[PDB]
Design a protein around this motif. Structure first.
Motif, mmCIF file in Angstrom:
data_model
loop_
_atom_site.group_PDB
_atom_site.id
_atom_site.type_symbol
_atom_site.label_atom_id
_atom_site.label_comp_id
_atom_site.label_asym_id
_atom_site.label_seq_id
_atom_site.Cartn_x
_atom_site.Cartn_y
_atom_site.Cartn_z
ATOM 1 N N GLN A 71 0.881 -1.163 0.077
ATOM 2 C CA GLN A 71 -0.044 -0.059 0.114
ATOM 3 C C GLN A 71 0.913 1.218 -0.081
ATOM 4 O O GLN A 71 0.563 2.129 -0.696
ATOM 5 C CB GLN A 71 -1.130 -0.066 1.112
ATOM 6 C CG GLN A 71 -2.076 -1.168 1.100
ATOM 7 C CD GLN A 71 -2.947 -1.240 2.447
ATOM 8 O OE1 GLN A 71 -3.874 -2.108 2.499
ATOM 9 N NE2 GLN A 71 -2.376 -0.351 3.511
ATOM 10 N N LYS A 72 1.951 1.241 0.700
ATOM 11 C CA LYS A 72 2.748 2.479 0.892
ATOM 12 C C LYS A 72 3.146 2.776 -0.423
ATOM 13 O O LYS A 72 3.234 3.691 -1.020
ATOM 14 C CB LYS A 72 4.123 2.398 1.964
ATOM 15 C CG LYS A 72 3.564 2.320 3.392
ATOM 16 C CD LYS A 72 4.837 1.855 4.163
ATOM 17 C CE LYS A 72 4.452 1.790 5.859
ATOM 18 N NZ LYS A 72 5.214 0.785 6.565
ATOM 19 N N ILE A 73 3.924 1.585 -1.284
ATOM 20 C CA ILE A 73 4.401 1.863 -2.435
ATOM 21 C C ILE A 73 3.317 2.316 -3.379
ATOM 22 O O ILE A 73 3.638 3.062 -4.346
ATOM 23 C CB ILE A 73 5.137 0.413 -2.918
ATOM 24 C CG1 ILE A 73 6.095 0.182 -2.043
ATOM 25 C CG2 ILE A 73 5.285 0.501 -4.437
ATOM 26 C CD1 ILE A 73 6.834 -1.564 -1.839
ATOM 27 N N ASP A 74 2.177 1.671 -3.447
ATOM 28 C CA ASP A 74 1.287 1.964 -4.276
ATOM 29 C C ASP A 74 0.880 3.572 -4.262
ATOM 30 O O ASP A 74 1.143 4.511 -5.351
ATOM 31 C CB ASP A 74 -0.095 1.300 -4.278
ATOM 32 C CG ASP A 74 -1.100 1.794 -5.385
ATOM 33 O OD1 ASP A 74 -1.944 2.473 -5.196
ATOM 34 O OD2 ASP A 74 -1.037 1.185 -6.362
ATOM 35 N N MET A 75 0.948 4.055 -3.023
ATOM 36 C CA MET A 75 0.473 5.326 -2.601
ATOM 37 C C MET A 75 1.634 6.542 -3.075
ATOM 38 O O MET A 75 1.341 7.396 -3.960
ATOM 39 C CB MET A 75 0.284 5.671 -1.457
ATOM 40 C CG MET A 75 0.050 7.130 -0.657
ATOM 41 S SD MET A 75 -1.350 8.033 -1.267
ATOM 42 C CE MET A 75 -2.520 7.081 0.003
ATOM 43 N N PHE A 109 11.444 0.654 0.089
ATOM 44 C CA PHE A 109 10.053 -0.141 0.353
ATOM 45 C C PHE A 109 10.222 -1.464 -0.610
ATOM 46 O O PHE A 109 9.903 -2.515 -0.145
ATOM 47 C CB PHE A 109 8.911 0.766 -0.050
ATOM 48 C CG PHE A 109 8.740 1.705 1.016
ATOM 49 C CD1 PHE A 109 9.068 1.948 2.154
ATOM 50 C CD2 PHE A 109 7.959 2.913 0.480
ATOM 51 C CE1 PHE A 109 9.076 2.926 2.948
ATOM 52 C CE2 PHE A 109 7.852 3.969 1.390
ATOM 53 C CZ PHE A 109 8.265 3.958 2.596
ATOM 54 N N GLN A 110 10.817 -1.236 -1.679
ATOM 55 C CA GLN A 110 10.781 -2.330 -2.572
ATOM 56 C C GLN A 110 11.632 -3.411 -2.010
ATOM 57 O O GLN A 110 11.289 -4.612 -2.174
ATOM 58 C CB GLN A 110 11.095 -1.872 -3.916
ATOM 59 C CG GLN A 110 10.085 -1.336 -4.724
ATOM 60 C CD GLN A 110 8.949 -2.098 -5.423
ATOM 61 O OE1 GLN A 110 8.509 -3.348 -5.023
ATOM 62 N NE2 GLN A 110 8.037 -1.505 -5.930
ATOM 63 N N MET A 111 12.869 -3.061 -1.581
ATOM 64 C CA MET A 111 13.765 -4.011 -0.749
ATOM 65 C C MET A 111 13.239 -4.642 0.250
ATOM 66 O O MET A 111 13.380 -5.746 0.292
ATOM 67 C CB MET A 111 14.847 -3.299 -0.607
ATOM 68 C CG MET A 111 16.128 -3.832 -0.102
ATOM 69 S SD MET A 111 16.843 -5.003 -1.521
ATOM 70 C CE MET A 111 17.364 -3.928 -2.769
ATOM 71 N N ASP A 112 12.494 -3.914 0.906
ATOM 72 C CA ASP A 112 11.801 -4.454 2.156
ATOM 73 C C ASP A 112 10.574 -5.675 1.948
ATOM 74 O O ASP A 112 10.829 -6.548 2.409
ATOM 75 C CB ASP A 112 11.276 -3.403 3.273
ATOM 76 C CG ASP A 112 12.146 -2.484 3.780
ATOM 77 O OD1 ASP A 112 13.213 -2.946 4.210
ATOM 78 O OD2 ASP A 112 11.765 -1.245 3.990
ATOM 79 N N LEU A 113 10.274 -5.157 0.876
ATOM 80 C CA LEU A 113 9.083 -6.042 0.455
ATOM 81 C C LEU A 113 9.727 -7.413 0.103
ATOM 82 O O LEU A 113 9.065 -8.544 0.086
ATOM 83 C CB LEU A 113 8.254 -5.381 -0.744
ATOM 84 C CG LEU A 113 7.187 -6.293 -1.273
ATOM 85 C CD1 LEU A 113 6.163 -6.838 -0.335
ATOM 86 C CD2 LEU A 113 6.589 -5.275 -2.450
#
Length: 232
Positions: free
Chosen positions: A133-137, A175-179
């Motif tokens: 969600q964070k990423i999408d926003m 965020f992408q790395m964390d995901l």
């Protein structure tokens, strides 16, 4: 504090982040053999010629197979949360997979304990959803800002928006790395397949691609080290 896995591993430093905040290639060295125990979220290295000689904390790590290593089979690469990375060689392909599963499982566990939850699986899924969600926003807002730029005539106002665009650029990498990392931890617990490394690398920003070019290394591992080095 229990032994999750133990075995013989050859080990070599791969990336180092001493200063500041600059990831560099480690000085070239012989592979060194150790008896290695994973206890909790820590790898303990024991001199096979005999209490631990080295200890490496591997919380919030990523482990990736390096099947294309030139001189060696069964090599994997662990990148930690500080910007360092380490190469390990095990005794077989099965034990490589076992090591990946055990390190990622210890990590999944340490994450759950950090959120004081007992149900690790449920937590990981919750954190994965939140990141998505964070990423999408932030991708949407980032595009809105870029589009907004052409209609901002005051240079100070434009400059401030450009700043935020780049802040989102960096955050989105993180965020992408964390995901990716949480998907590794979840796969470990479910016996699922690891997330796609090449998909992750497509999310590298231009400055990260430059940095990787300087390291001479384009991999999940060097990407992770660069991000983690930003304490990002």
């Amino acid at each position: 504090g229990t032994v999750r896995k133990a075995g013989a591993l050859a080990v070599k430093n791969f990336l180092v982040h001493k200063k500041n905040k600059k990831v560099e290639s480690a000085t070239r060295r012989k592979w060194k053999h150790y008896w290695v125990s994973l206890k909790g979220c820590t790898l303990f290295f024991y001199e096979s010629d005999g209490i631990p000689k080295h200890a490496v904390w591997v919380e919030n790590s990523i482990v990736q197979a390096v099947p294309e290593h030139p001189k060696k089979d069964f090599v994997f690469c662990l990148s930690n949360s500080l910007g360092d990375a380490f190469l390990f060689q095990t005794t077989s392909q099965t034990e490589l997979e076992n090591w990946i599963t055990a390190i990622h499982s210890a990590c999944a566990t340490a994450v759950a304990r950090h959120h004081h939850k007992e149900d690790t699986l449920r937590l990981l899924k919750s954190e994965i959803k939140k990141l998505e969600q964070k990423i999408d926003m932030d991708e949407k807002m980032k595009k809105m800002g870029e589009m907004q730029l052409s209609s901002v005539t005051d240079s100070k106002a434009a400059a401030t928006i450009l700043d935020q665009i780049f802040v989102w650029e960096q955050n989105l990498e993180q965020f992408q790395m964390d995901l990716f990392r949480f998907r590794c931890y979840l796969a470990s617990l479910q016996g699922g397949e690891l997330p796609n490394p090449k998909r992750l690398l497509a999310f590298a920003s231009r400055p990260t691609k430059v940095a990787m070019g300087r390291l001479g290394i384009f991999s999940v591992s060097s990407f992770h080290a660069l991000v983690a080095a930003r304490t990002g």
